[PDB]
Design a protein around this ligand. Structure first.
Ligand SMILES: Nc1nc2c(ncn2[C@@H]2O[C@H](COP(=O)(O)OP(=O)(O)OP(=O)(O)O)[C@@H](O)[C@H]2O)c(=O)[nH]1
Ligand SMILES: [Mg+2]
Lengths: 51, 85, 81, 146, 115, 157, 297, 51, 249, 55, 154
RNA sequence: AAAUUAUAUUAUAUUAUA
């Protein structure tokens, strides 16, 4: 039993969905600390295409 | 300063089990509520040990870094030592 | 040697689970309890949170015999040990 | 062109590309007592092996005379490899092991497993993948009879 | 000795808050709730949603969820009609005063969840 | 192109309900979804997240994604039925690539049908022989299509 | 004209163009500068943009004279292979390997047809070795454009520099903005054959590079892959199918074996079994069973 | 709305064809894909800042 | 206006259909042409049905189930306004409209006359005290659509602004069955109407008694008398791939 | 599919007993002591202008 | 109206000093014209305000030339005479907007913000659901629920 | 007594009293 994505605004609003409270996490962007302590191991170019 | 990254880290009735406590009840007690290995005895226990039934039942010594818990009761059972002080 | 994510460690997870089941007795693993198993000894272990189902809290949920209340104000005036 | 060649009728020859990175330092980490772990870091960071194959190269005749990848085989390969197929080229980036030899072994194994799963469309029509049609709701002319 | 009875008193105040009846959380000034009690929404609350509103004790979240699930006047009701604020819908049934928001006991620590 | 609000207003002095100025947490903003994040007064874990910019920006991004999802799903007058390859019409007898795999494929450039196959929607009344072989009673009526060559009011007759 | 489109097609175009960035087949069997057999990319990095630009003139002139000498060594061999040669019996056995051909049954190629398939491939080597040699004789120092693939071999392709700025105090007084930066030129060498003599000469560029200027190497070569239909067979679905419960968390280690599955290549003959009865039980032909067991009569 | 997700075997259809769920199961067998049971169908939210 | 003489001409005009539907982009002369043809029809003394906005029926304030039609629904306020305004528009011909299939034992308060005309029927319907008008409009719309379907000699032009809202689902949804089932308490009754919202299947327009009578006149071929000169509306909100929140000012 | 029910709960209790028995297991997050300078003794804060991430 | 909070009053010179930002914003001035056009009312002080600020924004980037000196104060006083003339027409439209909007809000059964007067319904400043429990300047306690300025049946 | 240097914009503050 599953639910479809809603079509009205009041069902999205009144649904008990918690908000973000603590620090958010990403599974690959947690080695890099924050966008201000964006860590780079090697100085490869941002347009570097892997062969 | 970044959000909630300070290295040096309250009564509430509807948020009793959910404020400065574990999110789920399925999870087990932390590491300080159990004996890891061979110990000579600790001078004080950590602040994250959950007050269990045997804390108020036996009552040998409760030393929290100080703090002396000599008044045992059952309203503290299920809660860590942070909100008890 | 695998590298990166834990999904690439197939044999290492198997060897770790086999070693953990090998060294650990069951008479030690009985003593570890969950949070609700400790909270069951509290006089009021269960109540609804005010986010979803706050109206479903009933008057039978209180441990009213474990305290002494005031008759005029209605507040709790004493607690039982 | 290196690689083994299969002459048995149960061995198909796939001409495929392999992309990989070689990197050796020559300025500061050329030699000293750090040189070992820095070279290992450069090698394990360059552990990616990109194995690429055109689907048009897979549409040849096998050793038994039947075509290797037909239309329904191509559809099942496109559905089983969703984002790994792009612009008519099946590409697999093997990053699992630290060495590139074990990575190209794992990539060859995964390519053969994907090909063996996609070849099931030649067994029958019950392995042909279903076409997903966006069938409309009943129209207003049909809803007028409600 | 005082913290245990204070926590017990706060939990008792929270449960008696959860039990007692509230005022109507909708604003009677804004449409569709502005209409007379003999026509419109107050008809449909009288014959279909009467026991459902009487059982939930007129808290704003179950009343708004029952108005969402009743379907015969959504989805425009919970968005277009203005509702009373969170501290104003907190007030108990039959208040008829704005001082009653500040008349309640503040010694408990229910975070605004007492009568 | 859309002219709705996406970003959150920044943090500054406490605004007042004046001309060209709304308070930072108002019930008019974001459908009142700032009611979760507001403080009515003019515990640190419940007070610090209401003032963080990344937290409130992530929350309004989630709410705008919910609005985009409900408006994309309210557009749907169809549903996806898994139909076998034999009974499908001639435009779908080809190798259809996955989403974001190839160039957006035209339907039929030879038959002068230049449109995306992924946006094609087929009528239910034309597939009753495929979707309903077990009924045999023609559950949906045939679609009446107008005669384009008939002299009607549109052609001054 | 003018360009007006649906927004859903524009949303689908812009995601498909970025996800298919490196979905490219470099070594294709084709004409000039697009088509090749191996592709070498030498990514040079240095601290100054004129340092990498002057290095990319030093390496491209080096790989032009070396690469012309190697392709001339291959062109002098291809023109001997086109004058005449004897067909390899292992090459002839590779064409007559399939059971059924395109025309039904065994397609028996003779030494005329197999040498015809070898001649038509060596004619492509001459048209592709002359394409590299003619582009190695063009860049005179009077008129040199090493950034164009139609003009010079090898050509240099631009790459975006890596730039990373730092925001730090100069004291709470002021903020300084200094940026680390290094610049990149890549060199694309497309050869229509695999040469280890060139790969050896390409790897030793690292020993005479410029000051504080390093490099990394990319190699995209063609390699034959065998899909064995006996190690990885195409079989029916099982009677009891798999469900989502076989794909739980930690079902990658406790539910599934690694590919491939071990299938037994040895069996034991039972009591009343014959040559036609074992082959029925193993699902093979009787003559195919005796060929695997030619020791036992 | 709230519904139960259906499955039709190819032996039940008048014309048999490979479904998409067993193709998903085959893809999860090949690439060792974790299938989350408690993933709700209503929560399909794209990262619209990037997409 | 004289259809029985030019019946083959009107059949050739509509290509045998019951009427015309006018479509185009938004902001064209659709509703303006609907008011123009209502002017043309009522200036020539023809009985004219005018729904000036279909979004008061389908996208209305509230939905109520039909009193005498099982499984059908009603928009009560739009029906009261329609039964008022159509009666005061066509009083000239509705007073001469004799009731053919109408019961004469209608519920009637003290001092009120039983309706003998169709104008008297709509005056019985819309002129009432709340909440008796809520069921009086249902009975009046049912018997008005019944009385319309029997007249085969008087031409009745029916003009609807926004027929595309009468051809798909009205924005009301069906109520949750726990509302009608009955509850003792909320804690142990296996229900979630107070905990979580959910979207039930949406009510189509054919389940409204007004559009039921309209589709009954449309689909049944025994009515060569009703000319449906209607149009569509494209008044909907824009959506171009993304959507933030609408600024309220 | 192989390990379900009591075997899974017993295995979770046994791995919890194994996890708690490791004296000195590094469970500290990385950002708590990622602001250590090597040339001088001044302590900065990661996330502010008192620290640069590359050098 | 959905803005029911307590508000802060502003002097009319600070409103018109915003210019093209809020006061003579072209989207706002258009929907003020639709209010007057609906009532069958000529938009003459609004058209007077738009024609002034259309030309005022046209030269607002030019620098004024330095005046070397005049014997009498006549060209300086004429430039100040037209300057205070333009403020008084914009003061009239500032009153004409607040006059008609409070008159339309009494017709559409629209409840205004806190301490806002509607001439037909609430002669005093209407207050509903304020943070202060009493009336801020009438010194009267507020009842629960809020005061209804209109009848019930919509 | 002129030329204008003038920034200008809007908001906040305290043991009410614990
Ligand atoms: N007087 C008059 N006005 C017209 C005429 N044609 C168009 N208009 C104007 O065009 C505008 C559009 O009128 P509508 O018919 O309601 O627009 P629409 O095509 O229905 O647009 P949607 O409601 O979104 O479907 C009206 O406001 C009229 O002012 C006409 O023939 N006569
Ligand atoms: Mg219109």
């Amino acid at each position: 039993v599953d639910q479809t994505p809603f079509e009205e605004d009041q069902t999205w609003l009144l649904h008990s969905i918690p908000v973000q409270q603590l620090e958010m996490h990403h599974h690959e962007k947690d080695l890099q600390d924050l966008p201000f302590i964006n860590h780079e191991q090697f100085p490869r170019s941002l347009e570097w295409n892997a062969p | 300063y970044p959000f909630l990254r300070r290295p040096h880290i309250n009564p509430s009735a509807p948020y009793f089990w959910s404020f400065m406590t574990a999110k789920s009840q399925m999870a087990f007690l932390p590491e300080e509520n159990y004996i890891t290995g061979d110990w000579t005895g600790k001078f004080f226990v950590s602040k994250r040990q959950v007050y269990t039934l045997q804390h108020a039942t036996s009552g040998a010594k409760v030393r929290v870094k100080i703090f002396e818990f000599n008044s045992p009761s059952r309203w503290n059972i299920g809660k860590e030592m942070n909100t008890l002080t | 040697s695998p590298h990166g994510y834990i999904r690439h460690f197939e044999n290492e997870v198997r060897d770790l689970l086999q070693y953990v089941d090998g060294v650990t007795p069951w008479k030690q693993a009985q003593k570890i309890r969950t949070y609700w198993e400790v909270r069951s000894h509290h006089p009021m272990p269960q109540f609804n949170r005010p986010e979803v189902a706050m109206h479903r809290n009933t008057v039978g949920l209180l441990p009213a015999h474990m305290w002494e209340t005031d008759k005029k104000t209605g507040k709790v005036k004493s607690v039982k040990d | 062109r290196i690689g083994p060649i299969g002459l048995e009728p149960h061995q198909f020859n796939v001409p495929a590309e392999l992309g990989f990175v070689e990197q050796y330092d020559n300025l500061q980490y050329k030699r000293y007592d750090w040189q070992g772990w820095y070279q290992r870091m450069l090698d394990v960071h360059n552990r990616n092996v990109s194995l690429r194959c055109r689907i048009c190269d897979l549409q040849r005749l096998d050793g038994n005379g039947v075509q290797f990848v037909d239309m329904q085989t191509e559809r099942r390969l496109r559905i089983l490899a969703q984002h790994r197929v792009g612009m008519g080229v099946l590409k697999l980036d093997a990053d699992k092991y630290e060495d590139q030899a074990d990575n190209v072994t794992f990539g060859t194994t995964k390519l053969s497993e994907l090909l063996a799963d996609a070849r099931k469309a030649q067994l029958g029509e019950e392995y042909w993948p279903s076409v997903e049609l966006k069938v409309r709701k009943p129209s207003g002319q049909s809803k007028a009879h409600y | 000795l005082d913290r245990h009875r204070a926590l017990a008193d706060s939990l008792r105040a929270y449960v008696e808050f959860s039990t007692s009846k509230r005022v109507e959380p909708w604003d009677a000034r804004f449409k569709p709730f502005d209409r007379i009690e003999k026509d419109g929404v107050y008809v449909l609350m009288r014959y279909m949603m009467e026991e459902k509103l009487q059982l939930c004790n007129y808290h704003h979240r179950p009343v708004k969820r029952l108005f969402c699930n009743i379907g015969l006047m959504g989805p425009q009701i919970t968005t277009k009609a203005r509702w009373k604020p969170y501290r104003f819908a907190t007030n108990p049934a039959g208040t008829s005063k704005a001082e009653r928001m500040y008349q309640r006991d503040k010694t408990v620590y229910t975070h605004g969840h007492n009568d | 192109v859309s002219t709705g609000e996406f970003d959150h207003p920044p943090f500054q002095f406490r605004q007042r309900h004046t001309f060209n100025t709304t308070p930072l947490h108002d019930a008019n903003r974001f459908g009142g979804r700032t009611a979760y994040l507001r403080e009515i007064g003019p515990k640190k874990q419940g007070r610090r997240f209401k003032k963080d910019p990344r937290t409130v920006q992530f929350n309004v991004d989630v709410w705008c994604a919910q609005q985009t999802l409900r408006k994309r799903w309210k557009q749907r007058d169809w549903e996806v039925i898994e139909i076998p390859f034999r009974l499908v019409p001639r435009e779908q007898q080809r190798v259809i690539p996955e989403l974001y795999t190839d160039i957006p494929q035209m339907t039929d450039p030879a038959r002068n049908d230049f449109s995306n196959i992924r946006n094609k929607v087929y009528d239910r009344e034309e597939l009753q022989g495929v979707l309903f072989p077990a009924a045999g009673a023609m559950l949906y009526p045939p679609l009446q299509r107008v005669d384009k060559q008939a002299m009607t009011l549109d052609k001054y007759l | 004209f003018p360009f007006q489109w649906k927004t859903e097609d524009w949303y689908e175009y812009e995601v498909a163009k970025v996800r298919n960035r490196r979905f490219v087949f470099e070594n294709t069997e084709e004409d000039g500068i697009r088509g090749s057999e191996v592709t070498y990319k030498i990514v040079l990095e240095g601290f100054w943009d004129h340092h990498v630009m002057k290095l990319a003139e030093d390496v491209c002139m080096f790989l032009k004279d070396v690469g012309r000498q190697i392709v001339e060594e291959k062109l002098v061999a291809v023109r001997r292979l086109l004058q005449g040669g004897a067909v390899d019996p292992e090459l002839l056995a590779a064409f007559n390997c399939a059971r059924a051909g395109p025309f039904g049954g065994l397609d028996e190629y003779d030494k005329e047809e197999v040498a015809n398939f070898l001649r038509s491939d060596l004619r492509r080597l001459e048209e592709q070795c002359l394409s590299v040699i003619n582009r190695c004789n063009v860049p005179v120092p009077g008129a040199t454009n090493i950034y164009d693939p139609h003009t010079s071999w090898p050509h240099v392709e631009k790459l975006e520099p890596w730039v990373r700025m730092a925001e730090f105090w100069t004291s709470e007084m002021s903020t300084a903005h200094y940026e680390f930066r290094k610049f990149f030129r890549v060199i694309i060498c497309k050869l229509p054959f695999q040469s280890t003599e060139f790969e050896k000469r390409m790897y030793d560029i690292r020993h005479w590079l410029h000051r504080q200027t390093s490099c990394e190497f990319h190699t995209i070569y063609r390699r034959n892959v065998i899909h064995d239909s006996a190690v990885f067979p195409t079989e029916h679905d099982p009677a009891t199918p798999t469900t989502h419960e076989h794909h739980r968390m930690f079902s990658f280690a406790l539910d599934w074996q690694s590919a491939p599955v071990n299938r037994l290549s040895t069996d034991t003959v039972h009591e009343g079994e014959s040559w036609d009865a074992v082959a029925q039980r193993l699902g093979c032909s009787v003559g195919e069973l005796k060929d695997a067991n030619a020791e036992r009569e | 709305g709230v519904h139960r997700v259906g499955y039709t075997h190819p032996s039940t259809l008048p014309v048999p064809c490979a479904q998409r769920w067993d193709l998903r199961l085959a893809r999860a067998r090949i690439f060792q894909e974790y299938i989350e049971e408690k993933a709700p169908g209503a929560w399909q939210l794209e990262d619209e800042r990037s997409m | 206006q004289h259809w029985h003489t030019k019946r083959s001409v009107l059949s050739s005009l509509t290509n045998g259909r019951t009427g015309f539907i006018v479509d185009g982009p938004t902001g064209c002369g659709k509703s303006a042409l609907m008011c123009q043809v209502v002017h043309f029809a009522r200036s020539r003394n023809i009985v004219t049905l005018y729904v000036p906005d279909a979004k008061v029926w389908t996208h209305g304030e509230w939905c109520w189930p039909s009193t005498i039609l099982p499984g059908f629904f009603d928009a009560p306020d739009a029906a009261r306004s329609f039964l008022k305004y159509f009666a005061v528009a066509n009083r000239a011909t509705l007073t001469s409209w004799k009731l053919r299939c109408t019961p004469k034992d209608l519920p009637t308060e003290q001092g009120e006359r039983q309706p003998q005309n169709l104008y008297e029927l709509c005056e019985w319907g819309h002129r009432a005290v709340a909440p008796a008008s809520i069921d009086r409009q249902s009975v009046c719309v049912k018997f008005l659509m019944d009385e319309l379907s029997e007249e085969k000699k008087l031409p009745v032009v029916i003009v609807v602004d926004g027929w595309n809202l009468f051809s798909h689902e009205t924005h009301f949804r069906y109520p949750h069955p726990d509302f009608l089932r009955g509850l003792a308490s909320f804690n142990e009754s296996s229900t979630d109407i107070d905990l979580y919202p959910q979207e039930l299947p949406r009510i189509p327009a054919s389940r409204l008694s007004f559009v039921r009578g309209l589709n009954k006149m449309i689909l049944s071929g025994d009515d060569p008398n009703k000319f449906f000169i209607t149009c569509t509306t494209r008044d909907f909100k824009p959506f171009d791939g993304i959507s933030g929140f609408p600024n309220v000012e | 599919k192989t390990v379900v029910g009591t075997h899974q709960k017993m295995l979770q209790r046994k791995v919890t007993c194994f996890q708690y028995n490791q004296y000195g297991l590094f469970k500290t997050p990385y950002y708590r002591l990622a602001n250590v300078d090597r040339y001088h003794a001044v302590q900065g804060v990661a996330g502010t202008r008192e620290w640069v991430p590359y050098v | 109206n959905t803005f029911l909070t307590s508000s802060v009053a502003t002097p009319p010179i600070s409103v018109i000093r915003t210019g093209p930002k809020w006061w003579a914003h072209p989207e706002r001035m258009v929907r003020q014209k639709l209010m007057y056009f609906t009532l069958g009312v000529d938009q003459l002080p609004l058209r007077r305000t738009a024609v002034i600020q259309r030309d005022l924004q046209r030269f607002h980037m030019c620098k004024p030339p330095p005046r070397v000196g005049d014997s009498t104060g006549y060209k300086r006083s004429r430039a100040a005479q037209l300057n205070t003339w333009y403020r008084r027409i914009q003061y009239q439209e500032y009153h004409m907007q607040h006059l008609f909007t409070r008159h339309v809000w009494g017709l559409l059964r629209v409840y205004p913000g806190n301490t806002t007067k509607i001439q037909g319904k609430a002669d005093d400043g209407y207050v509903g659901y304020d943070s202060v429990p009493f009336h801020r300047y009438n010194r009267a306690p507020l009842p629960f629920p809020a005061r209804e300025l209109y009848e019930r049946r919509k």
